[model samples]
Target: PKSRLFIGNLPLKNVSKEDLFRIFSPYGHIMQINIKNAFGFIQFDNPQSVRDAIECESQEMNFGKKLILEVSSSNAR
Candidate 1:
């Protein structure tokens, strides 16, 4: 499988490209981001990063407001 991650349950008002980068950057080199409303897809530069992201378990926020993030065995069309 290619290096990809699925992020979901976001705040439409708070989350932004910058915030995403800030949160995701430490885990790996983010090759790309695709956002759609409160959910999106991410492509990392390597497999190890993908594992780290998943193991991190989806708990983050754009600001003080708590948000939900869940990952799965994701695929792209």
Candidate 2:
């Protein structure tokens, strides 16, 4: 839904669920998070939470890398 965000350019070498939670949980109550090789998906409990956190897109972050955030195109159950 609208609360879902696609997290791109994640550090593939040492990424973990807790790492993502630490970075993203401040935005809102995370409904769920799923990671792959270099990207992931995070869902907040509400659409407003996604709006508040959208500015982080393409911003430099703690992982020594800049991340990209986008509204997920794929509809997730």
| Model 2, span 1-77: residue lDDT tens | 43686666754667666876676677655567667767777776666566455545334333344666665333558
Q: 19 in model 1: Cα distance from truth in Å? A: 1.6
Q: lDDT tens string, model 1, 1-77?
A: 44677665643556666776777688766666677876677766666676566456465333233554433334544
lDDT of 2 at 69: 63
Q: Which segments of candidate 2 are over 4 A away from where they belong? A: 11-13, 57-67, 72-77
**Relative to the unseen true structure, what is the C-alpha lDDT of residue 27 in candidate 1, on a scale of 0 to 100?**
77
How many clashing residue pairs, candidate 1? 0
- What TM-score should be assigned to candidate 2? 0.58
Note the clash tally of each candidate.
0, 0
